[PDB]
């Protein structure tokens, strides 16, 4: 009756990790792809040779 | 061409021809028909003689 | 009877694996955002060794320059005939490369 | 893996950063040379080129229908069939008879259309042609005036 | 009808792959309309010698 | 006295269009010589015939 | 109103941040801000010049995120002493 409540509070302990890691995914991804939209609105995309 | 002392008329490897002056440093018998020449960018003036192809 | 510890361990597995993998692709794509520091170079070929620290490079559309190394780019490696990567602002040599030209030598 | 020697990639001005390999860039001239018109020149309409019709059909259309018949014997079909001769015997007619009496994705290709001014298009165009005819795997591929390229 | 003189050296322009486009301009004018009349003259200027 | 009224006009360039993406313009374009230009459309266009 | 010769006293940190921020701003013409004090019409001392993040679209005022300012200067609120943003800077790092 004590370890199950410990796992219940550890579910929220992992949900805070879910919140912060989904933040490090999503809020950082908004940074990355807002910068990449800033690279995706240009004059050309200059053709070239690799 | 040099119209007088240290005022050149210089062709480039961008193709066109310019009209600048050269320094007080370079000896006047290094450009005697020509040279592979060293030019600045903003000042765009004659600096040095490159070693010829030989 | 205590399968809520495995409903918490399964929440750990699923939610942490998904958020960690999303933030791992976000780590490598934050590194792709960090590539907005690695912003472009030029490439030319060493035409000669001017001085021990100077080289004449070949802009492939045009003109020829005077460059140096970064600091320790092995000035014996940069023989006339190698291809280098050139800086964008300073225009000097950044990184050596291989390659060479027309495949009529290669296809035979 | 999208990169290789010889890639048109679309690059930013100010960053000079690669963003696309030009993935979906099939032009109007690229898609116009593809054949959806399907001509109808009959074999009986052509006369006298008997053994050349034999070589033509029996060495191109039989790979279209019988690869295993080459595999049951242990041989290999030729790659490359060339027509040449005087400019009145009917050369384009045989490619049109192919387009009529076979249905395995006839592909014309005109010669000086491959002569480009926007430089780098014709090689991409030939690779597009073989990729497109690869999408419809039996590939009837014809080019007239190969000397012009 | 629509009658068109053709100077042969209206195809002979300087730069690479342009008289080809001049033939393109010809066929663009041609397939706009009906019963039109292209008149060549002096096709040695265009040429028949390989 | 009509000069300065026309001075806020724009030197905007004619082009030639390479392709159309699906569901959006996302148009790729070349003018003559520079590069192959990735563009938008303005809002007051007829988005059919671009 | 009336006009009298305006004077820009510079913080030397501003000189350092301009040279460094445009040095890192390699050709791509970065944007940053100026953060200073309203003394009068005819003088200005700038006391702080900090950095603004690189935007690859076009050097604009619409790249100036005001909540970036709010958060950065919020960290700078108890840190030393904040003041008014009194301007901005762009770069042409090769030519004059
Ligand atoms: N067996 C045939 N039966 C009927 N007409 C034929 C036959 N062979 C040739 N022709 C005619 O000859 C012309 C076809 O030859 P071409 O169109 O010249 O083929 P081709 O590819 O153009 O040859 P070249 O070298 O490219 S000019 C048409 O006028 C046909 O009617
Ligand atoms: Zn500037």
Swiss-Prot record, chain B:
Superkingdom, taxonomy of origin: Eukaryota
Location in or out of the cell: Cytoplasm; Nucleus
Quaternary structure annotation from Swiss-Prot or TrEMBL: Component of the 19S proteasome regulatory particle complex. The 26S proteasome consists of a 20S core particle (CP) and two 19S regulatory subunits (RP). The regulatory particle is made of a lid composed of 9 subunits, a base containing 6 ATPases including PSMC4 and few additional components. Interacts with NR1I3. Interacts with PAAF1. Interacts with TRIM5. Interacts with ZFAND1.
Sequence similarity: Belongs to the AAA ATPase family.
Summary of the function given for this chain in its UniProt record: Component of the 26S proteasome, a multiprotein complex involved in the ATP-dependent degradation of ubiquitinated proteins. This complex plays a key role in the maintenance of protein homeostasis by removing misfolded or damaged proteins, which could impair cellular functions, and by removing proteins whose functions are no longer required. Therefore, the proteasome participates in numerous cellular processes, including cell cycle progression, apoptosis, or DNA damage repair.
Name assigned to this protein: 26S proteasome regulatory subunit 6B
Taxonomic classification: Eukaryota, Metazoa, Chordata, Craniata, Vertebrata
From Swiss-Prot, chain C:
Taxonomy, superkingdom: Eukaryota
Disulphide-bonded residues: none
Function text: Component of the 26S proteasome, a multiprotein complex involved in the ATP-dependent degradation of ubiquitinated proteins. This complex plays a key role in the maintenance of protein homeostasis by removing misfolded or damaged proteins, which could impair cellular functions, and by removing proteins whose functions are no longer required. Therefore, the proteasome participates in numerous cellular processes, including cell cycle progression, apoptosis, or DNA damage repair.
Natural source organism: Homo sapiens (Human)
Cellular compartment(s): Cytoplasm; Nucleus
Subunit structure: Component of the 19S proteasome regulatory particle complex. The 26S proteasome consists of a 20S core particle (CP) and two 19S regulatory subunits (RP). The regulatory particle is made of a lid composed of 9 subunits, a base containing 6 ATPases including PSMC6 and few additional components. Interacts with PAAF1.
Residue(s) carrying N6-acetyllysine: 58
Family: Belongs to the AAA ATPase family.
Name of this chain's protein: 26S proteasome regulatory subunit 10B
Swiss-Prot record, chain E:
Domain of life: Eukaryota
Induction / repression: Expression is not cell cycle-dependent and occurs throughout the cell cycle.
Compartment annotation: Cytoplasm
PTMs per UniProt: Monoubiquitinated by RNF181.
Family: Belongs to the AAA ATPase family.
Free-text function comment from the UniProt entry: Component of the 26S proteasome, a multiprotein complex involved in the ATP-dependent degradation of ubiquitinated proteins. This complex plays a key role in the maintenance of protein homeostasis by removing misfolded or damaged proteins, which could impair cellular functions, and by removing proteins whose functions are no longer required. Therefore, the proteasome participates in numerous cellular processes, including cell cycle progression, apoptosis, or DNA damage repair.
Assembly and interaction partners: Component of the 19S proteasome regulatory particle complex. The 26S proteasome consists of a 20S core particle (CP) and two 19S regulatory subunits (RP). The regulatory particle is made of a lid composed of 9 subunits, a base containing 6 ATPases including PSMC2 and few additional components. Interacts with NDC80/HEC; this interaction is detected only during M phase. Interacts and SQSTM1. Interacts with PAAF1. Directly interacts with TRIM5. (Microbial infection) Interacts with HIV-1 Tat.
Name this polypeptide is given: 26S proteasome regulatory subunit 7
Organism encoding this protein: Homo sapiens (Human)
Swiss-Prot record, chain G:
MPN domain ranges (all copies): 8-96
Recorded superkingdom: Eukaryota
Binding site for Zn(2+): 90, 92
Expression (tissue specificity): Widely expressed. Highest levels in heart and skeletal muscle.
Residue ranges the record marks as coiled coil: none
Known function: Component of the 26S proteasome, a multiprotein complex involved in the ATP-dependent degradation of ubiquitinated proteins. This complex plays a key role in the maintenance of protein homeostasis by removing misfolded or damaged proteins, which could impair cellular functions, and by removing proteins whose functions are no longer required. Therefore, the proteasome participates in numerous cellular processes, including cell cycle progression, apoptosis, or DNA damage repair.
Subunit structure: Component of the 19S proteasome regulatory particle complex. The 26S proteasome consists of a 20S core particle (CP) and two 19S regulatory subunits (RP). The regulatory particle is made of a lid composed of 9 subunits including PSMD4, a base containing 6 ATPases and few additional components. Within the complex, PSMD4 interacts with subunit PSMD7 through their respective MPN domain. Interacts with TXNL1.
Family classification: Belongs to the peptidase M67A family. PSMD14 subfamily.
Protein name: 26S proteasome non-ATPase regulatory subunit 14
Encoding gene per record: PSMD14
Included stretch of the parent chain: 24 to 119 of 310
């Amino acid at each position: 009756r004590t370890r199950l409540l410990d796992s219940e509070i550890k579910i929220m302990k992992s949900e805070v990790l879910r919140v912060t890691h989904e933040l490090q995914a999503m809020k950082d991804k908004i940074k990355e792809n807002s910068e990449k939209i800033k690279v995706n609105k240009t004059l050309p995309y200059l053709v070239s040779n690799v | 061409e040099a119209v007088d002392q240290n005022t050149a008329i210089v062709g480039s490897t961008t193709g066109s021809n310019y009209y600048v002056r050269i320094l007080s440093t370079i000896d006047r018998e290094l450009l005697k028909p020509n040279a592979s020449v060293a030019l600045h960018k903003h000042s765009n003036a004659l600096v040095d003689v490159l070693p010829p192809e030989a | 009877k205590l399968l809520e510890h495995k409903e918490i361990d399964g929440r750990l597995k699923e939610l942490r694996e998904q958020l960690k993998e999303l933030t791992k692709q976000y780590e490598k794509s934050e590194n792709d955002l960090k590539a907005l520091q690695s912003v472009g170079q030029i490439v030319g070929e060493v035409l000669k060794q001017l001085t021990e620290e100077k080289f004449i490079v070949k802009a492939t559309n045009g003109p020829r320059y005077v460059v140096g190394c970064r600091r320790q780019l092995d000035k014996s490696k940069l023989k006339p005939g190698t291809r280098v990567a050139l800086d964008m602002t300073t225009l000097t040599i950044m990184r050596y490369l291989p390659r060479e030209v027309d495949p009529l030598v290669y296809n035979m | 893996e999208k990169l290789k020697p010889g890639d048109l990639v679309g690059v930013n001005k100010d960053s000079y950063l690669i963003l696309e390999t030009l993935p979906t860039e099939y032009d109007s001239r690229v898609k116009a040379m593809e054949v959806d018109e399907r001509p109808t020149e009959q074999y009986s309409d052509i006369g006298g080129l008997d053994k050349q019709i034999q070589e033509l059909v029996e060495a191109i259309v039989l790979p279209m229908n019988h690869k295993e018949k080459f595999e049951n014997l242990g041989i290999q079909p030729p790659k490359g069939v060339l027509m040449y001769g005087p400019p009145g015997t009917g050369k384009t007619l045989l490619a049109r008879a192919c387009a009529a009496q076979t249905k395995a994705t006839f592909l014309k290709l005109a010669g000086p259309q491959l002569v480009q001014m926007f430089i780098g298009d014709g090689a991409k165009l030939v690779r597009d042609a073989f990729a497109l005819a690869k999408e419809k795997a039996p590939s009837i591929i014809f080019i007239d005036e190969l000397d012009a390229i | 009808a629509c009658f068109i003189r053709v100077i042969g050296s209206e195809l002979v322009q300087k730069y690479v792959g342009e008289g080809a486009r001049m033939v393109r301009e010809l066929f663009e004018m041609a397939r706009t309309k009906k019963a039109c009349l292209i008149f060549f003259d002096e096709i040695d200027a265009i040429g028949g010698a390989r | 006295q009509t000069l300065q009224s026309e001075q806020p006009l724009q030197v905007a360039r004619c082009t030639k269009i390479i392709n159309a993406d699906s569901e959006d313009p996302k148009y790729i374009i070349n003018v003559k010589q520079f590069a192959k230009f990735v563009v938008d459309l303005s809002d007051q266009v007829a988005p059919t015939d671009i | 109103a009336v006009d009298t010769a305006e004077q820009v006293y510079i913080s030397s940190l501003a000189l350092l941040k301009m040279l460094k921020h445009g040095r890192a701003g390699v050709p791509m013409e970065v944007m940053g801000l100026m953060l200073g004090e309203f003394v009068d019409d005819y003088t200005v001392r700038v006391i702080d010049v900090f950095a603004m993040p690189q935007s690859g679209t076009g050097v604009s005022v619409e790249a100036v995120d005001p909540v970036f300012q709010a958060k950065m200067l919020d960290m700078l609120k108890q840190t030393g002493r904040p003041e008014m943003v009194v301007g901005w800077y762009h770069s042409h790092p090769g030519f004059g």
